[PDB]
Scaffold this active site. Sequence first.
Site, PDB file in Angstrom:
ATOM      1  N   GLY A 142       0.738  -0.952   0.177  1.00  0.00           N
ATOM      2  CA  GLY A 142      -0.245  -0.041   0.035  1.00  0.00           C
ATOM      3  C   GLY A 142       0.233   1.464   0.160  1.00  0.00           C
ATOM      4  O   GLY A 142       0.691   2.430  -0.084  1.00  0.00           O
ATOM      5  N   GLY A 184       5.407   3.638   0.550  1.00  0.00           N
ATOM      6  CA  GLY A 184       5.796   2.660   2.171  1.00  0.00           C
ATOM      7  C   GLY A 184       7.071   3.277   1.412  1.00  0.00           C
ATOM      8  O   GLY A 184       7.781   2.363   0.538  1.00  0.00           O
ATOM      9  N   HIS A 206       8.270  -3.761  -5.364  1.00  0.00           N
ATOM     10  CA  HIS A 206       7.262  -3.420  -6.126  1.00  0.00           C
ATOM     11  C   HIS A 206       7.265  -1.811  -6.717  1.00  0.00           C
ATOM     12  O   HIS A 206       6.848  -1.388  -7.687  1.00  0.00           O
ATOM     13  CB  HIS A 206       5.503  -3.861  -6.258  1.00  0.00           C
ATOM     14  CG  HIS A 206       4.699  -2.819  -7.101  1.00  0.00           C
ATOM     15  ND1 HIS A 206       3.509  -3.570  -8.023  1.00  0.00           N
ATOM     16  CD2 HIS A 206       3.603  -2.286  -7.391  1.00  0.00           C
ATOM     17  CE1 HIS A 206       3.272  -3.183  -8.579  1.00  0.00           C
ATOM     18  NE2 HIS A 206       2.751  -2.274  -7.861  1.00  0.00           N
ATOM     19  N   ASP A 234       3.245  -4.792 -11.947  1.00  0.00           N
ATOM     20  CA  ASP A 234       1.728  -5.259 -11.175  1.00  0.00           C
ATOM     21  C   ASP A 234       1.759  -6.677 -11.027  1.00  0.00           C
ATOM     22  O   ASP A 234       1.345  -7.443 -10.450  1.00  0.00           O
ATOM     23  CB  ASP A 234       0.427  -4.887 -12.206  1.00  0.00           C
ATOM     24  CG  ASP A 234       0.021  -3.530 -11.610  1.00  0.00           C
ATOM     25  OD1 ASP A 234       1.224  -2.731 -10.487  1.00  0.00           O
ATOM     26  OD2 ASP A 234      -1.157  -2.868 -12.213  1.00  0.00           O
TER      27      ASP A 234
END
Lengths: 122, 122, 122, 122, 122, 122, 122, 122
Positions: H29, H31, H47, H89
Amino acid sequence: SVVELGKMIIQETGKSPFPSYTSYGCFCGGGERGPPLDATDRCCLAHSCCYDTLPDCSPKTDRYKYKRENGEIICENSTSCKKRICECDKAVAVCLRKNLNTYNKKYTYYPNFWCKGDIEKC
Amino acid sequence: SVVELGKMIIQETGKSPFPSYTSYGCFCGGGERGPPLDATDRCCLAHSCCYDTLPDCSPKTDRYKYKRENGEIICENSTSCKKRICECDKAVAVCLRKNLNTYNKKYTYYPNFWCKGDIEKC
Amino acid sequence: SVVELGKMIIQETGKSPFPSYTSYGCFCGGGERGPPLDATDRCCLAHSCCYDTLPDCSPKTDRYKYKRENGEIICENSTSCKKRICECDKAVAVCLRKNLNTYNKKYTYYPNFWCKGDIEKC
Amino acid sequence: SVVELGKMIIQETGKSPFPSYTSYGCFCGGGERGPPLDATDRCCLAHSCCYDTLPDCSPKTDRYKYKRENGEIICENSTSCKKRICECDKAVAVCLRKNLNTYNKKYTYYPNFWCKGDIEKC
Amino acid sequence: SVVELGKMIIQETGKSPFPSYTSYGCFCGGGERGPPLDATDRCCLAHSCCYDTLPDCSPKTDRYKYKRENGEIICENSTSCKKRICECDKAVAVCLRKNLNTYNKKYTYYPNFWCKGDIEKC
Amino acid sequence: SVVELGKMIIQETGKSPFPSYTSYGCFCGGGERGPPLDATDRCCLAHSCCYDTLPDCSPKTDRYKYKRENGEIICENSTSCKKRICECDKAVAVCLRKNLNTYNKKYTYYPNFWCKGDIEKC
Amino acid sequence: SVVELGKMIIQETGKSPFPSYTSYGCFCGGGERGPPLDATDRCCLAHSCCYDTLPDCSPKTDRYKYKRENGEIICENSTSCKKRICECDKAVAVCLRKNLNTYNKKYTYYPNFWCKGDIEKC
Amino acid sequence: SVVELGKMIIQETGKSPFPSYTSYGCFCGGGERGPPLDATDRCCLAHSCCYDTLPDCSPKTDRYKYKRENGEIICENSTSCKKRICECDKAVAVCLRKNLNTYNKKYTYYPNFWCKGDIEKC
C-alpha cells in the site's frame, strides 16, 4: 490521552485498539462523514463529538490518571482538562463494550472513502 | 458496479461477498441451473433475472454512484443504465439482508452434484 | 460404491469427503464442465472418466469389498463390475493422496462463475 | 488402571481420553483387526500387546500409583503386576504424546467394522 | 434400511450420521435410559419408540424408497412395513434438522453408562 | 468426585470442563487469589469455599453417586462426605449454568498478571 | 517498554502478545511461581529475572527507542535504564522466536492449578 | 491501474487486496521505510521499486488491459507505459501468490510509523 484511551479500551473490551477499533466503520479512528455503520461506529462519533467540547485542551497528548472501583472507571480531578478528557474516553470505552454484541469483524477495516454522507454535526 | 454491489452487500447484510456470497448456492455469485437452495439463493436468482432486463447495459462493469438517505440506498441518475443497474443491486442487497435469518453457511460449499436441474425461467 | 470410495479417501488422504472433497473445484463430488482447477480437481475428472467406461455397471451404488496388504488397496473380483468400479475408486484415492501437497482449501468454495467452460473429453 | 491410564493420557497429550482416544483408529479402546491407520493407532496396538503379557494380571482393572518426578512417569514397585501394568500405561501415554504431530481429528471417531484386516500378531 | 435413514439424515441436516449422531446424547444410536440430554436427544428417543410400534416389521433392515419432492420427504407404499418404517425415519430426520439450533458439539460423543435413568417407556 | 463434577458440568452447562472451565478466571479449576473476574468465577470461588467446610473429606477424589429426576441432580447418602461433597458440586454446576449469559471465552486465557488480589475470605 | 516489547514480539515471532503470549504458561505476561512449562515459558522467566536487575528503573513503563539493522535489534542509550530495559526485551523477543519450534497453544489456557510451585531462583 | 492490480491480486492469491494487502508489512500500500517484515512485504517493496523505473508514466493511475492464458497474465502493448506498468503489477501479483506460504495475518495491519528504517534505495 492516546495512552489512556488505549488502555481503557483493551481493558474494557479485550480487543487491542489497533487494529480492532483504529479504522472500524466510518468514525472509529476519526472521520466526519457517515452515516454510522452500527452502534460501535456511533460510540466513536459520540467520542469525537465529545472531544470537540474541549477546544481548550489537547485530548490526544493530555496525559491523565484513572482508577477502577467496583467495575467503574474513576477519572482523576487534578485539572479541568484531565477530568473532562478522561470522561470522554471513559464513555467511549464503556460504549464499545456495551456494544461488543454487534461488533462486526468485517467492519474492522472499513474504507474511509465509502463514507459519503454529509459532515456530521454533534 | 460489481464493486458497488459489493459495498451494498457489506453495508446491508454485514457480510463480505467473498466468501459469504461468491459461492452461495446455485445462483449467488453466478449460475443458471437450479433449483435454488433457499431464500438467499432465490435473491440471487431474482438478481440474475433483473440483469436480464438490461441487455442494453453492462451491469457487471458499468460503474455507478449511490447515496444513503434515511438509511435507505438512493440510486443515482446520470444515465438510465446506471440507475437501472443500481436498482437491481439495491434489491438483491435488501433481499439478502431480509433473509439473513435462514442463511446457511454450508450452502457456501454445497455438494458439486447439486445444481443440476434445468435452467430457471424469470 | 460411493460408500467404499469415501472410506478409501478417508484412509488414503486423511480427509473426510465432506467437506474436504464433496465440493472441491469443478469435478470432485460431481461436475462436467471445467477447466479443472488443479491436480486434485484433475484426479476427480479422471475418476469421472473412469466411471464412464462402466455403462454396464452402477459405479455409484453397486457395493463391493476390498482389502489392504502391505499398505496397499487390493480390489476384489466377485463380479467384473465390482472389480472395475473398485479400480476406479482406488485410483482416485491414490491420486488424491498423492496431490495433498497442492490441496487448496479455497477451491472447496470457489466462485460460482468458474467451471462454466466446455465439457472435458475423456 | 482405567484411572491411572486416564490420568497419564491427559497429562501427557492434553486431550481427554474420551472422546479423543477411546475410539481412534482400529486399536484405540480395543481392537485386534487392523491395519493401523497411523502412528497413534500403533501406540494403542503396542499397548494392547503389552497387556497381552499380563495373564499374570487384570491390567484393565488392577489399581496402582505413580509419581511425577522431574516431569516424567515413575512407576511403583509395590507388586510385580502393579509395576508391570504401570509400565504399559506409561509407555502408551508417552507414545501418544510423541505422535501428536500426526494425530488426525478425523480418525478420532473410526468405526471398527472398517478394520477388515486379519487378527493382529504381536 | 440403515441406508435410507443415513441418507435422510445428511440430506436433512448436512451432518454425516456417523459420527455426528451415532452416539449423541443418551438415545441417538440406541439406548433405553435417559433422561435425554436435549431436543436432539428427544428426537432420537422418539425415533426408537416409533420403531417399537413396528414389532410388525424389522426397521433397521427392511430396505425401501422415498421421493424428495418439494422439500418434503415422501415415503413409498409398496408394503406396509416400508411405509411405516419410512415414516419413522422421515420424522427423526425432520426432527433433527428442526433442532439443529441446539445441537451440542460435545454431546456428539456421550458415554452411555452416564445415562442411569429408568428404562424409558414409550 | 472431580469426575462426578465434570459430568455434572457437561450435563448442566453443555460445556466440557476442559477447556471451558479448567482455566476460567481466577478460581475455576484452581486458584486462591482474587479478585474474581465475573459471575462464573464467583461460582467457583463459592465452590472452593464450599470445599473448605469439608476438611474431614477428600472432595477431589472421593467418588459418589447421583441421579437426575427430570432435570434436577439428586445426591446420594451412603456417607456424610459423599452427600456434602456432592451438594457442593451440584451447587457449582447449577451456578455455572445460571450464569452462561455472561460467560466470557477470553477469561479462559486471561492476562497472566490478573490474579494478584488478596486471598479471598469465604 | 511494554509497548516496545510487544512490537519486538510481533517483529521477531510473528505472533501478537495478545493472545499468543499474554497468558502463556506460568511466566509470560506475569507470574513468579513455577515450575515453568517449557522453553518458551522459560524465556519469560529469564525476562522476569532480567527485569529484576533493574530496581532503579521502571522496565514496564519507561518508553525507549530501538532500530532494526541487518536483521538485528539495536537498543538505544539516552539513559542507562532505557538501554538495559531494552536489552532485556530484545533477548526475550529473540528467545521467544528461537523456540517457536515447541510453542504449545494449550499453554495459552493451562489448568488453573498449574503454577503453584516454588518461586524460581534467578 | 488500481483495478488491474486489484484484479490480478485476488485472481492470483484469492485474497481481496483490501484489506489483505492494502497495509501489510512496511511496504504494502506504499511506504519507503522498512526493513521488510517478511517475504510478502518484500514483494511490495520490489513493486514500489518497479514503479520507480517508470517516471515517464503514471503506474498508480494509468489504465490498461491484460489477458489470462493457460493461467498466466498476459500484458498488452498499446503503449509502452501500459506494458511496463502491467508487467510491474503482474510481477507483484505473482510474487504474492508465490509467498502465501508465509503470509502472516498479524502483519495484515502493520502500523507504518513502526517502520523506522532508512529510505529504501532500489
